[PDB]
Each structure stands twice: as C-alpha cells, then as structure tokens.
C-alpha cells in the first residue's frame, strides 16, 4: 500500500530542536505501520489505559549513544507502559525489513509477539536485532534531529534532559 509519512517535532530541555520525518512501510507491514501512524495522529482517542493513544507529549525515555533512541511509553513514561491501538500487545507481523543503518524505525518489545506502542530509531546499523524486532519505517528527514537527541543519551540509557515529542502527526 502507499507509504504514510509522519513526523515528530522535538524539544530538548524545552527548546525547539527540529522535525523528524518518517516513512512507514505500509506495503510491507500494514498492521504495524497502521498502529504507529494512528499513534502519530491520536485518531483512536483514549486507550484501555485511560490515557490518549498518542505520542504527543511523550518522551524518548531511553537513549543509548551509538545504539538507538527509544520512546512510545505514553502510559508510564519509563519503558514499562505503552499501548497499541489494537489494545495491549500484538504479534510480530513479519521480519522482512532489516536493521540496516541509522534512521531505521523498529518496534521495541518484551520478546516474541509483544508489540505495544514502544519503538526505537536506530543511530547505527543494529544487525543483531534482525528477526527479533519488527522494522516498519525509516527516517527520511531530520536525521540531524535524531543525532541531537542521541547526544543526550547515556550508556545507562537515562537521558541527560527531557527529549520530548512536542508535536506529531501525519503528512499528506
């Protein structure tokens, strides 16, 4: 299917830091792409958690230099929460796409078939995640914004300051 384009407007410590534009692989992983797209628009409203099914206002809570930036936990904000629009967890749709380099967009999980709303953007090639995380898009603009967020990560995963998805949505 035609490929959706979505964006995040990022703040770092409250400071406007630019836009990350992403292309989703609707044609390869439609269920996975459709979940992320709707979480960018917020169109499915309040989820089972009672919080909005929406990345807006959420943070990259886990950021590791030379690895990736991870976000999508809008229910607990710490890596233990998050919710897909389908309502809890859904199976890995396929592993056709691989972690080929910086910019790759892929699902975070807790093992096989545990996709929620958490995701990461790779800042390096992470071949060791192939077949274990579902890859469903890539950055096409704003890789420099991804690097700026990455600069605030630590080996420990804890960010130096709040890296927020201040706005987000779908481009037509």
Kindly tell me which of 3 and 132 has the beta carbon lying closer to Au ion: 132
Is 44 part of the annotated catalytic residue set?
A: no
Among residues 70, 115, 118, 152, the one annotated as catalytic is 70
Q: Is 78 a catalytic residue?
A: no
Structure-block tokens of residue 62: 């886990």
Selected from 132, 148, 167, 169, the binder of Au ion by CB under 5 A is 132
Cβ at position 82, least distance to Au ion in Å: 16
Catalytic member of 60, 120, 138, 152: 120
Return the residue matching tokens 């274990």. 132
Q: How far is the CB of 171 from Au ion (least distance, A)?
A: 30
Active site residue 129: yes
120 is catalytic: yes
Binding region for Au ion (CB under 5 A): 129, 132
């Amino acid at each position: 299917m035609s490929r959706s384009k979505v964006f995040f407007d990022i703040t770092i410590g409250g400071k406007a830091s630019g836009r990350i534009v992403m292309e989703l692989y609707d044609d390869v992983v439609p269920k996975t792409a459709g979940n992320f797209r709707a979480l960018c628009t917020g169109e499915n409203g309040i989820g089972k958690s009672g919080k909005p099914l929406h990345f807006k206002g959420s943070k990259f809570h886990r950021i590791i230099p030379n690895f990736m930036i991870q976000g999508g936990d809008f229910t607990r904000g710490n890596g233990t929460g998050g919710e897909s629009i389908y309502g809890e967890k859904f199976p890995d749709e396929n592993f056709k796409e691989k972690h080929t380099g910086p910019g790759v967009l892929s699902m975070a999980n807790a093992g096989p078939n545990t996709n929620g709303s958490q995701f990461f953007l790779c800042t390096v090639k992470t071949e060791w995640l192939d077949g274990k995380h579902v890859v469903f898009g890539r950055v096409v603009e704003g890789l420099d914004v991804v690097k700026a967020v990455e600069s605030n990560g630590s080996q420990s995963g804890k960010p130096v300051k709040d890296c927020m998805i201040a706005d987000c949505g779908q481009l037509k």
